[PDB]
Amino acid sequence: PLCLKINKKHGEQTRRILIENNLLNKDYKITSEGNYLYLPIKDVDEDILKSILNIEFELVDKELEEKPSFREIISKKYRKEIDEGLISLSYDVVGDLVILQISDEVDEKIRKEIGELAYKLIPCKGVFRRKRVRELEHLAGENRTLTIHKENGYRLWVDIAKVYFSPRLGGERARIMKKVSLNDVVVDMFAGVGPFSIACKNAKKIYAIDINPHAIELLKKNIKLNKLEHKIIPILSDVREVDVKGNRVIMNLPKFAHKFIDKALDIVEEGGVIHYYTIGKDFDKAIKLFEKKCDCEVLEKRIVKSYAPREYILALDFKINKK
Numbered sequence: 001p002l003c004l005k006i007n008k009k010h011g012e013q014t015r016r017i018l019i020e021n022n023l024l025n026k027d028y029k030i031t032s033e034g035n036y037l038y039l040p041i042k043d044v045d046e047d048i049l050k051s052i053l054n055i056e057f058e059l060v061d062k063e064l065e066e067k068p069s070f071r072e073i074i075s076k077k078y079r080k081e082i083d084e085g086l087i088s089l090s091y092d093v094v095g096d097l098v099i100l101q102i103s104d105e106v107d108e109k110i111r112k113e114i115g116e117l118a119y120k121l122i123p124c125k126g127v128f129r130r131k132r133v134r135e136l137e138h139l140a141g142e143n144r145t146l147t148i149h150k151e152n153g154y155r156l157w158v159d160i161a162k163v164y165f166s167p168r169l170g171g172e173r174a175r176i177m178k179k180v181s182l183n184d185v186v187v188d189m190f191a192g193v194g195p196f197s198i199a200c201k202n203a204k205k206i207y208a209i210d211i212n213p214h215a216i217e218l219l220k221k222n223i224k225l226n227k228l229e230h231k232i233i234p235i236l237s238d239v240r241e242v243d244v245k246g247n248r249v250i251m252n253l254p255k256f257a258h259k260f261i262d263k264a265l266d267i268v269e270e271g272g273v274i275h276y277y278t279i280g281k282d283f284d285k286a287i288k289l290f291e292k293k294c295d296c297e298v299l300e301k302r303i304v305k306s307y308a309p310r311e312y313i314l315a316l317d318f319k320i321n322k323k
């Protein structure tokens with residue numbers, strides 16, 4: 001498939017950089033031919049790669065070997081419509097449930113068939129598909145949308161019909177989890193059911209804020225389940241109206257975080273850190289927004305996942321030196 005071609009002397013270094021940026025397509029075998037290394041890579045453009053690599057490279061097409069199924073079967077049977085949107089090969093597994101990406105236009109009993117296949121080939125108790133928190137269409141197995149998801153050693157109650165939750169962000173949450181220091185006071189601006197907040201358990205105090213009450217209900221259940229009731233303070237409100245202070249501030253709202261930077265700088269103490277999440281073709285825009293608003297330094301930046309062609313969800317840790 002799509003591969004990143006580089007001189008093999010840079011092999012291990014490039015592999016590591018692709019893994020941290022969720023770009024390594026682990027379903028293929030990195031292959032070495034001649035003095036070149038070919039790394040199977042996920043959807044990405046040459047321009048943004050230049051912001052995470054200083055060596056020369058080439059993106060190319062190439063057959064490579066791999067490291068029942070579902071993705072296997074659906075891919076051929078419905079390749080017709082899949083090939084044109086209707087159906088996606090990508091799906092999410094939140095705890096006990098599976099959520100397919102069937103942009104319905106596909107018949108209903110056709111949707112039940114796929115869900116049924118999924119239910120059959122994928123260990124789960126329920127299968128749904130969708131259409132921000134959107135309405136779900138049940139397609140097989142148990143019809144319960146409430147489940148518990150395990151990640152990074154902790155547990156999270158999630159009701160997929162009520163709040164937004166991406167299991168794909170477990171890696172990014174684990175990254176932050178390890179940077180947290182004992183004396184930190186964390187402000188999780190858009191907490192959902194509390195994933196970053198539970199992840200930041202090393203801190204001495206955490207403020208978990210969200211405007212969705214069901215989200216806050218799951219948050220509370222999660223604070224208890226993980227035994228962090230004397231650590232995490234749940235807050236039902238629009239974050240703009242909350243007056244709290246912290247040295248570590250999390251902004252997990254990609255599409256609109258840019259509209260909340262002023263509030264974030266008001267919460268953050270100087271010398272503190274803001275973990276910003278945004279959508280972009282690269283890191284330039286976000287850096288500029290922050291550079292104009294205060295004196296800061298980027299400490300680490302990562303591509304989190306793809307959003308659409310030449311569009312990605314990005315993470316940047318900004319150290320705020322002076323406001």
Ligand SMILES: Nc1ncnc2c1ncn2[C@@H]1O[C@H](C[C@@H](N)CC[C@H](N)C(=O)O)[C@@H](O)[C@H]1O
Pocket residue numbers: 163164165166169189190191192193194195196209210211212215237238239240252253254
């Ligand atoms: N003005 C606001 N104040 C507080 N929370 C908000 C506001 N607007 C949206 N939200 C919440 O922002 C959240 C964005 C989600 N990406 C949070 C995900 C969560 N951090 C997780 O790790 O699962 C949603 O749960 C919204 O309910």
Ligand SMILES: [Zn+2]
Pocket residue numbers: 213214217
């Ligand atoms: Zn509720």
Ligand SMILES: [Zn+2]
Pocket residue numbers: 229230231
């Ligand atoms: Zn207490």
Ligand SMILES: [Zn+2]
Pocket residue numbers: 132164252253254
């Ligand atoms: Zn969101």
Ligand SMILES: [Zn+2]
Pocket residue numbers: 289290291292293294295296297
């Ligand atoms: Zn700045």
